[PDB]
């Protein structure tokens, strides 16, 4: 798995977008997570309440939680594939007390790309969606490697 420069560009560019409203776009995609796989919600004790769209929409938790996840998720993404020492840890939050199963994070991916297109899809077209479908498998494989260094499964 790699991405050219053109494509890393392509990546960043639109997380510029996403930056200029994080807490929206982390809104839009946990709850775009949450309606597709209901299941998940389960895993967070922070929200297991929440039932509707309505009790997502309006949730304190949920709007902080979007922002943590794309705030950590950016950080990675802007290294451009390469590693480094200081972001080997893995970011957790009082939100879960479980480690979240990798499936979950491609269960996130999904709700990444869609909610991408709907809010840009001028400059998030297919080229843009096959990069940022890349970076976020890069994102993944580096999130299994933390679990099996550390002894969490996944």
Same mark, same amino acid.
């Given at each position: 798995m790699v991405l050219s420069e053109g494509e890393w560009q392509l990546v960043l560019h639109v997380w510029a977008k996403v &930056?200029?409203?994080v807490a929206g776009h982390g809104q839009? +995609?946990? +709850?775009? #997570?949450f309606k597709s796989h209901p299941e998940?919600? &389960?895993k967070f004790d922070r929200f297991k309440h929440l039932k509707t769209e309505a009790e997502?929409?309006?949730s304190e938790d949920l709007?902080?939680?979007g922002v943590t996840v794309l705030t950590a998720l950016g950080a990675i993404l802007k290294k451009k594939g390469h590693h480094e020492a200081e972001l080997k840890p893995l970011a957790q939050s009082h939100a879960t007390k479980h480690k979240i199963p990798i499936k979950? #994070? &491609?269960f996130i991916s999904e709700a990444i790309i869609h909610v991408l297109h709907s809010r840009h899809p001028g400059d998030? $077209?297919?080229?843009?969606? $096959?990069?940022?479908n890349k970076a976020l498998e890069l994102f993944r494989k580096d999130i299994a490697a933390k679990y099996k260094e550390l002894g969490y499964q996944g």
């Open positions: &930056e200029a409203d839009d +995609i946990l +709850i775009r #997570l998940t919600l &389960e997502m929409k309006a709007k902080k939680h979950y #994070l &491609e998030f $077209g297919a080229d843009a969606q $096959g990069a940022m």
